[PDB]
Amino acid sequence: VLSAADKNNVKGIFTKIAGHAEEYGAETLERMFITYPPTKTYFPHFDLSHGSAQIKGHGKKVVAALIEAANHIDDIAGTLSKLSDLHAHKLRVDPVNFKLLGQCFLVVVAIHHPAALTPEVHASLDKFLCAVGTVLTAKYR
Amino acid sequence: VLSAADKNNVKGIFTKIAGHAEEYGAETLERMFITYPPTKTYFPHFDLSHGSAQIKGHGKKVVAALIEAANHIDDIAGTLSKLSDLHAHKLRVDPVNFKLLGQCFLVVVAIHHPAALTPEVHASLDKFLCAVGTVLTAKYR
C-alpha cells in the first residue's frame, strides 16, 4: 500500500497546499466541469458559473477532505467513510469520475508547484488520490 | 472493503470451487488466452496448446492462491504479498489483465454452477476478484 515514500511525498505537496484549499479546490472542479462536461450532472443544485460561491465553498470541502485524509493517512477509509455512503450509495457517483477529478487536482498542483510535482511525487500522489477515489466508491465493494 | 454478505457469498461459490481447482483454473486460463489473445504475451515460455501440463499446473496454483485468499479474506494483502512482487515488479502486467482473468473465472463459475452465481453472489465474487487484482497490482501503486 502507501509506502514510506508515498506517505511522505503526498504530505510533501499537501503541505505546500494549505492556505490554498478553497482556491485549489474550486479550480479543480472548474477544470473538471469543463475539460469533462458530463461531470456537472452531479451538481444540478449548483450554480456552475465560474468562481461561484458553491463551487468555491465545496471546493473548500473537497480539499479539506483531501488534506484530512493526508493527515490520517494510516486509516484512509476510517477518515472518509462518511463520504462513501454519500458518494457511492446516495449520489451514485460513477467510478470513472474520481479518475477525472484526480487528473484535475493533479493539474492544479502542477500549475502552482511545477518544481514540487516531480515524477516521483506525481506517482505517490496518483496512488493516494486513487486510494481516495477507491474509498468513496466503496458503498458497493 | 468486502461486507459480511460479500464474504459469505464468496465462501459459498468457492466451497463449490474447491475440489475442481485444477480444471477450473485451467479453463479460466485458456478462455482468457483465447477470448483475449494478447494476454498470451506473459506466457511465452508456456505451451498454450489445449490442456498442456503448464496451463493445468499454473491453473491449479492460481485458483489455489484464490482459495487461500478466499479464506484469509481479512488480509488479502498479507496473504498474497509475494504475488505482488511477482505480478507488479517482476512480470509487469497491465492492470487491465486482472480484470480480464477475473471475468474468465466468472464465466467458468457461471458454466459450472449457474444456480450459485446469483446476481448477489456474482456481485460479491467480483468485488473479491477485484480486490485480488488490486493487491497483486498494488506493487506498483
Added chain:
Amino acid sequence: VHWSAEEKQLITGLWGKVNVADCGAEALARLLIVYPWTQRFFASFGNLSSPTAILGNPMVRAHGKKVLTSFGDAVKNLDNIKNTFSQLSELHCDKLHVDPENFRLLGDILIIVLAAHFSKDFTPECQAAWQKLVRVVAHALARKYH
C-alpha cells in the same frame, strides 16, 4: 473488425438459442446489482432499492429484453453494426452521458449471463467470438464521442 466464418456460426448458432426476454432481464438486473452506480440512469424505473426489487421490476425486465434484442441486431448484421447502433450512439453518447466504460461492463455481464444459460456449450471459442461482438457493439455505441 473482421469476422471469421467460424465466428459467424458460433454467433448465429448461439443467438438462435438465447432467451432474449430472460437473458436481458438478468444482464440488466446484474448490471444494476454489480454496478449499483448505473442505477442513476434508471430512476425512471423506480424501485431498484434491493437486488430483488431490480429482479422484480417489470421495466428493468422489459428494458433488458429491449437491450438484448438490440445485441441481436448486431448478430443479425455483423457487417453493419456501426450504423445499426448510430441512432442509439446518439442517445447514449449525446442525450444520456453514459460513460463508455459501462458498455464494456454490460458486455461482460451478458457473457457471464450467456455463460450461465448455455454452460459447456459456451465454448471458449464461442465466448471469444462473442466478447468480441460485445466489444464491437460497445465500440459502435461510443462512436458519437469520437
Added chain:
Amino acid sequence: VHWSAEEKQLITGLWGKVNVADCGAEALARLLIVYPWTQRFFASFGNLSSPTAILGNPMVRAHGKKVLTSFGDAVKNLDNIKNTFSQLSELHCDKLHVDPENFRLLGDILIIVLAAHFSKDFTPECQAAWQKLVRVVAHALARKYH
C-alpha cells in the same frame, strides 16, 4: 470529431511554445514512473530500474521527443488525425499489444507535463481542448483495435 475555431487556436497557440524535447522526455519519463508496468514495452531502452535512470536515459528521452513530435502531427492536421496515426495504430495494437487504456494514460500525463510547463497559461479551456486532442489521438491510435 468536430473541432472549434477557439479550440484550434488554443491547441495551435500552445503547441508553438512547448519544448517538444523536454516536454517530450518528461511525459514518458512519467508514464514509466507513475505507471511502471508500461516499461515492458521498453526493455530495449535498457535501464528503467529507477526514476533517475528513466529520466537520464538517452533512449527514453529520444523516445518522448518522438512521441510528442507525434502529437504535433495531429495539431497540424486535426481533420486527418486518424489517417496520421493509422500506421502507428498497426504498430501499438497489432504488433505491440499496448492496451488502449495506456494511450489514455500517456495523455493524462502529457496534460500534467503541459500544465507544468505553462502553468496559469494552461487554462481550464485550454486544458479541455488539449484533453480533447489527446482523446482523439489515443482514439485514432486504438482504431486498429476496435
